[PDB]
Structures are given as C-alpha cells and as structure tokens.
C-alpha cells in the first residue's frame, strides 16, 4: 500500500529526526564535563545531556503531522510524560551491544552502567533499561520504523491529564497504520515477523521504565543539594 499521505508522513518524520539528531554529537562539548571519579559525579553531565535531549525531542514532536492541531495543554501533557521515554528510545541509535554502552564519539561521551549509577540510579532502573536497549537493538528497525515509533510514543491518548483524547488517538492511529503498512510493504521477512507487536511491546516496557524513573527522581529531588544540580528545563519537565 503506502498511500500518498503515508509516504509523506514518513518523509516528514525522517527529516524531522534528521533535523533534531546530530550523529556526531558535537554539542556535547557544551555540557558540564562528565566526572567518573561523594557519588552523583555524573549528575551534572547527564542532567545536561538529558536537558539537551528534551529540547530535541520537543523539536521532533512539533514536526509530527497532526501534533500542532492539539491544544497547548495537551501538547504539554504529551511531552512531559513521554520525554524520558523518547530519550531512551532515541538513545538506541548510540547504544551498542558490543559493550552495552551508549557510544557518542569519544571516551568522554561514552556512557555505561556505572555512569548511569553515578547519576543516582540503581539496577532498579538500569537492569531493565539495558534489557530494553538490547531488545530494541535486536529488532534492527529501519530508520522509518524508528521515527514512527518515537512519534507514536509521544502521541499516546492514555497519558494522564490528556483532554482531547480522541484527537490524540486519531493522530496516533494515523501513525500506527503508517507503521503497520510500512512493515508489510517495506520490511521483508524474517525481520518483519511480529515486528509491529514487538514494537508496541517496547512502548509498554517504556511505561515501566518511566515509572521507575519517576520514583527515583522523587528521591533525588528530595534533597535540594541534588535538585540544585539539574537544569531549569529538566526541573520543569520532570517536576519542580
């Protein structure tokens, strides 16, 4: 199939991704220097990376056909709830199964399980986080499916606080059918076996990851000393 409108949706999302994801990770030099030596030594660096990533995820969302039609408040509710999920999702691009780490160019910007723990997280989040990256990496998604999955994650109707739930659903459904159809026409077997159902399952895994993220964030921000080390956007998006 792949109608005219669907080839457009994919072309748009591919470009929107391209305009918001620099595979050379050159801006990482603006972030506060990472410290891998009191723990939480990676909090300043990773706080900045995440802050940066939230900005890029937002720019991506604004290019999702249909997203601009949502109200101001619904756009806000969808971004606040999916931000950490799309960052985990989009980070799969730099993640490598070679050594289970996110490799962004240089040693300075190569993150692993210990850096994550030096940001305030335990295996509570890390174990399933790496499990997530591994299952996602194995699916060997086409970049088309990758951007479609991120957009579907952002435009989810069940996010609490949503108002125009039916409008959100209409936008997401349009994206799902574009993805379901792209897989059937563009993704060849075996890689396409259960591919869609596996992709949706990843969205559920992310709901679990978000949940853990939220609980530990409550404990971290529990002490202004650490909360003071974040950025203004991170505080606003995850909670102030």
């Amino acid at each position: 199939k792949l109608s005219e409108e669907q080839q457009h949706i994919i072309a748009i999302l591919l470009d929107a991704h391209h305009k918001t994801y620099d595979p050379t990770y050159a801006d990482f030099r603006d972030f506060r220097p990472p410290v891998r030596m009191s723990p939480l030594s990676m909090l300043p660096h990773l706080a900045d990376l995440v802050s940066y990533s939230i900005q890029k995820v937002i720019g991506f969302a604004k290019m999702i056909p249909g997203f601009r039609d949502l109200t101001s408040d619904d756009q806000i509710v969808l971004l606040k709830s999916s931000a950490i999920e799309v960052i985990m999702l989009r980070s799969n691009q730099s993640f490598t199964m070679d050594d289970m780490s996110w490799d962004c160019g240089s040693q300075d910007y190569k993150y692993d399980v210990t850096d994550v723990s030096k940001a305030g997280h335990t295996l509570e989040l890390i174990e399933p986080l790496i499990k997530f990256q591994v299952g996602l990496k194995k699916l060997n998604l086409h970049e088309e499916e990758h951007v479609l999955l991120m957009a579907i994650c952002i435009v989810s109707p069940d996010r609490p606080g949503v108002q125009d739930a039916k409008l959100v659903e209409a936008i997401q459904d349009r994206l799902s059918n574009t993805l379901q159809t792209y897989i059937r026409c563009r993704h060849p077997p075996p890689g396409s076996h259960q591919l869609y159902a596996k992709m949706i399952q990843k969205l559920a895994d992310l709901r679990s990851l978000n949940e853990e993220h939220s609980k530990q964030y409550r404990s971290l921000s529990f002490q202004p000393e650490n909360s003071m080390k974040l950025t203004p956007l991170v505080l606003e998006v995850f909670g102030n």
Binding site: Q55, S72, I76, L79, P232, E236
Partner: peptide, 11 residues
C-alpha cells in the same frame, strides 16, 4: 502547573 520553558519551546 504552567510550564514557561516548555511553553516557549512548543510555540
């Protein structure tokens, strides 16, 4: 909760 920054980035 009014999100000034998220608001401006979406605008």
């Amino acid at each position: 909760k009014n999100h000034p920054m998220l608001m401006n980035l979406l605008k």
